[PDB]
Design an enzyme around this catalytic site. Structure first.
Site, PDB file in Angstrom:
ATOM      1  N   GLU A  35       0.821  -1.237   0.000  1.00 18.53           N
ATOM      2  CA  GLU A  35       0.000   0.000   0.000  1.00 18.53           C
ATOM      3  C   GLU A  35       0.848   1.276   0.000  1.00 18.53           C
ATOM      4  OE1 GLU A  35      -3.085   0.230  -0.700  1.00 18.53           O
ATOM      5  OE2 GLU A  35      -4.053  -1.708  -0.204  1.00 18.53           O
ATOM      6  N   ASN A  46      -7.768   8.897  -6.038  1.00 14.19           N
ATOM      7  CA  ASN A  46      -8.560   7.977  -6.866  1.00 14.19           C
ATOM      8  C   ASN A  46      -9.317   8.620  -8.014  1.00 14.19           C
ATOM      9  OD1 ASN A  46      -9.184   6.528  -3.642  1.00 14.19           O
ATOM     10  ND2 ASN A  46      -7.712   5.935  -5.190  1.00 14.19           N
ATOM     11  N   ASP A  48     -12.381   8.543  -8.764  1.00 14.53           N
ATOM     12  CA  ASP A  48     -13.666   9.101  -8.285  1.00 14.53           C
ATOM     13  C   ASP A  48     -13.586  10.413  -7.465  1.00 14.53           C
ATOM     14  OD1 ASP A  48     -12.819   8.152  -5.749  1.00 14.53           O
ATOM     15  OD2 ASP A  48     -14.638   7.076  -5.323  1.00 14.53           O
ATOM     16  N   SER A  50     -11.981  10.700  -4.579  1.00 18.45           N
ATOM     17  CA  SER A  50     -11.612  10.409  -3.170  1.00 18.45           C
ATOM     18  C   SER A  50     -10.044  10.319  -3.074  1.00 18.45           C
ATOM     19  CB  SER A  50     -12.292   9.110  -2.617  1.00 18.45           C
ATOM     20  OG  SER A  50     -11.728   7.947  -3.257  1.00 18.45           O
ATOM     21  N   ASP A  52      -6.619   8.271  -0.758  1.00 16.77           N
ATOM     22  CA  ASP A  52      -6.143   7.221   0.184  1.00 16.77           C
ATOM     23  C   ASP A  52      -4.941   7.773   0.985  1.00 16.77           C
ATOM     24  OD1 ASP A  52      -7.918   5.405  -1.091  1.00 16.77           O
ATOM     25  OD2 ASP A  52      -6.364   4.416  -2.209  1.00 16.77           O
ATOM     26  N   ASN A  59      -9.268   5.190   2.685  1.00 15.45           N
ATOM     27  CA  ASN A  59      -9.933   6.048   1.692  1.00 15.45           C
ATOM     28  C   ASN A  59     -10.953   7.037   2.319  1.00 15.45           C
ATOM     29  OD1 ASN A  59     -12.384   6.134  -0.479  1.00 15.45           O
ATOM     30  ND2 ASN A  59     -10.372   6.437  -1.421  1.00 15.45           N
TER      31      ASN A  59
END
Ligand SMILES: [Cl-]
Ligand SMILES: [Cl-]
Ligand SMILES: [Cl-]
Ligand SMILES: [Cl-]
Ligand SMILES: [Cl-]
Ligand SMILES: [Cl-]
Ligand SMILES: [Cl-]
Ligand SMILES: [Cl-]
Ligand code: NA
Length: 129
Positions: A35, A46, A48, A50, A52, A59
């Site tokens: 990660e 991301n 969309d 959003s 992380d 997220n």
């Protein structure tokens, strides 16, 4: 902060993640590795809109508040910035709520694709734990 492998294994164990919901310490170290490469300040946007955040890439769509993810939730009750601290407490407490959500560590797409089914004990090999 960029953790060393055994150093992060020790901090995760201290904060009660070792065998949490049945996932051995090696699974959590392997997930952090793919990660964030063990860097607490990692961030990734991301498609969309959003974002992380942190050692486990939690997220903003569901779990933390960043002020810029329309129509999202903050189920961990924290600002996403708390997830970038050198102290991992906020990331571990939020990961406990995520892994309890119904799908286990499959919530982390990189754990499913790179850690699931593999020799995860290798991640804690040689560590004084
Ligand atoms: Cl490593
Ligand atoms: Cl393990
Ligand atoms: Cl928001
Ligand atoms: Cl922005
Ligand atoms: Cl909420
Ligand atoms: Cl906030
Ligand atoms: Cl810590
Ligand atoms: Cl499970
Ligand atoms: Na949010």
């Amino acid at each position: 902060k960029v953790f060393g492998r055994c150093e992060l294994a020790a901090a995760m164990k201290r904060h009660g993640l070792d065998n949490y919901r049945g996932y051995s310490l090696g699974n959590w170290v392997c997930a952090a590795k793919f990660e964030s490469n063990f860097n607490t300040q990692a961030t990734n946007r991301n498609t969309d809109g959003s974002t992380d955040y942190g050692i486990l890439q939690i997220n903003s769509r569901w779990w933390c508040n960043d002020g810029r993810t329309p129509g999202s939730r903050n189920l961990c009750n924290i600002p996403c910035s708390a997830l970038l601290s050198s102290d991992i407490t906020a990331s571990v407490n939020c990961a406990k709520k995520i892994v309890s959500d119904g799908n286990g560590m499959n919530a982390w797409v990189a754990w499913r694709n790179r850690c699931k089914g593999t020799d995860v004990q290798a991640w804690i090999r040689g560590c004084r734990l």
